[PDB]
Design a protein around this ligand. Sequence first.
Ligand SMILES: *[C@]1(OC[C@H]2O[C@@H](O)[C@@H](O)[C@@H](O)[C@@H]2O)O[C@H](CO[C@H]2O[C@H](CO[C@H]3O[C@H](CO[C@H]4O[C@H](CO)[C@@H](O)[C@H](O)[C@@H]4O)[C@@H](O)[C@H](O)[C@@H]3O)[C@@H](O)[C@H](O)[C@@H]2O)[C@@H](O)[C@H](O)[C@@H]1O
Length: 333
Amino acid sequence: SDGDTAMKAFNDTFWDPNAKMFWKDSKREKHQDFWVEAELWELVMDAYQHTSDPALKAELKTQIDDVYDGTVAKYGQDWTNNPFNDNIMWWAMGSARAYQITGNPRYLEAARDHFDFVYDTQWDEEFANGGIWWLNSDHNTKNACINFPAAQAALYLYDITKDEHYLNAATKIFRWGKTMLTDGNGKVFDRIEIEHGAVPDATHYNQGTYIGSAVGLYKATGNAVYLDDAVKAAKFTKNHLVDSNGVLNYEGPNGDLKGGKTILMRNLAHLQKTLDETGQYPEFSAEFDEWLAFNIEMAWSHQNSDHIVDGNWAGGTYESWSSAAAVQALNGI
Ligand SMILES: *[C@]1(OC[C@H]2O[C@@H](O)[C@@H](O)[C@@H](O)[C@@H]2O)O[C@H](CO[C@H]2O[C@H](CO[C@H]3O[C@H](CO[C@H]4O[C@H](CO)[C@@H](O)[C@H](O)[C@@H]4O)[C@@H](O)[C@H](O)[C@@H]3O)[C@@H](O)[C@H](O)[C@@H]2O)[C@@H](O)[C@H](O)[C@@H]1O
């Protein structure tokens, strides 16, 4: 019941049923940012997939549609006017998942049209020998936060359509990103800036989307190297993006990063499921499971009386992005 309790509390605190959007914080003065709203959309989907309560499941399934509808009312159906390719791709990825859950073809169309806009027009072979640009306005940097989500979105589209076009895209994007945006041992770099080079700053959400795309490529291709890729990035996270007690770091004050544990936990759950199914990396699997469970318990021990957990997991206004990670964590496998 913990996942159910956490999701219900999150909705009670942050869901606006009038605007069909999440509030940015408990003051209820501003709705959540566009890109983060896609991530909260995926949280609703994860809760939907996790719960065993048929009543809550039906409510969450409806909410999947309402989140899309509330966003389209404010931002339109065509997001290609947004200069941030990642903003577009986070929504394309969400849309692909919403299709999988609802079977509603509008989500497949949203996913495919937006993925195609970004991949077909924003991939470049010249700078850095490959990669998708962060922006469709100015072309100055190629970033983990667009490239690995794009590989994930391609993998969802492959699974849905069976069109090898999308597997080929995922393979190509990931190969480039592994080569140019990692150290080869699981540290994912933030971006490569033209006239500068790589910026080797690691963050939770970029570890996460790298891990998720690697797991998805493992499953689609049968090539064990991808599982090894995922494990190295999980190990790096567990050892190097934690405090002295092994609790995942707080990445504030940056507003985009503060909630990044949400994306990380979503993707660590994918790795956990694949390790459990396959029996591969059994020693690491045991250590990883124990460490995940520890993080989750520590986070939830800081819940307030309304069952909301601030995103500083080691320690009056609660924010929906920062608070989402603890909810995500209870709505995994
Ligand atoms: C996309 O959203 C764009 C914009 O949309 C607006 O509507 C609104 O929602 C805004 O809030 C959105 O920004 O772009 C997001 C931002 O991407 C850029 O910025 C992030 C964060 O950059 C910072 O952090 C990195 C990483 O390292 C730093 O933090 C770590 C961890 O704490 C430290 O260890 C390290 O020392 C360092 O301090 C850093 O490299 C940057 O210089 C900067 O300090 C980057 O991660 C991106 O690559 C972009 O530069 C993005 O988060 C989303 O994808 C969103 O869709």
